[model samples]
Target: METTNGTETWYESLHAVLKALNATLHSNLLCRPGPGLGPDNQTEERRASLPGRDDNSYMYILFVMFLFAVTVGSLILGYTRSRKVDKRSDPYHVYIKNRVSMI
Candidate 1:
């Protein structure tokens, strides 16, 4: 399984896939949530054991995406700002006419 832009090793890819599977299924079978909330804290003993129910995979995925977005944004900002004083480029370029090359 290629991952992380195909730089991830086989073991790493396996780990990521298993983690994702556990999260999507909301199953603690692969990853346990500590001692888990006591039955008194959960509607059922089974529920208490399932950490995925309390913490879904979406949160984990969202955090990863947010981190990636910030990292990419930071890289782009550095390349754009450090290279120049922002005179030749517009980070928010929105136009259809100026885009055409004049002959």
Candidate 2:
């Protein structure tokens, strides 16, 4: 009914499904290693752990590329559509600019 700093979940209901996805994504951070960040691996172990091109998950490459295109297209579309109304010193802009961090 009410929520925030978050309650933790799954039964295919929206709240339950979303909570499950949240937990799954969080756990996956530890499950999968980070990629070869910043052009090159930071260490020998990182380099060794780097995924080889021949590994099995090739199908997901297209999925990722499509996801990227969709996200970029959406951001471009959203920004282009919204660019007209940003005349005044927007409070949202000010709030975001001044704010450091919060959950």
lDDT of 2 by residue, 1-103 (tens): 5655443422346677788999999898777667765567455453346666644566688688889899898889877795565544554565585665332
How much is the lDDT of residue 53 in candidate 1? 33
User: How many backbone clashes does every candidate have?
Assistant: 0, 0
In TM-score terms, candidate 2 sits at: 0.26
Candidate 2 regions with alpha-carbon error over 4 angstroms: 1-48, 77-85, 88-103
TM-score of each: 0.20, 0.26
Candidate 2: worst 10 consecutive residues by lDDT? 3-12
lDDT score of residue 5 within candidate 1: 48
lDDT of each: 0.69, 0.67
Instruction: Please give, for residues 63-101, the per-residue lDDT of candidate 1 as tens digits.
Output: 989999998998898786766643444435533457843
Residue pairs clashing in model 1 are none
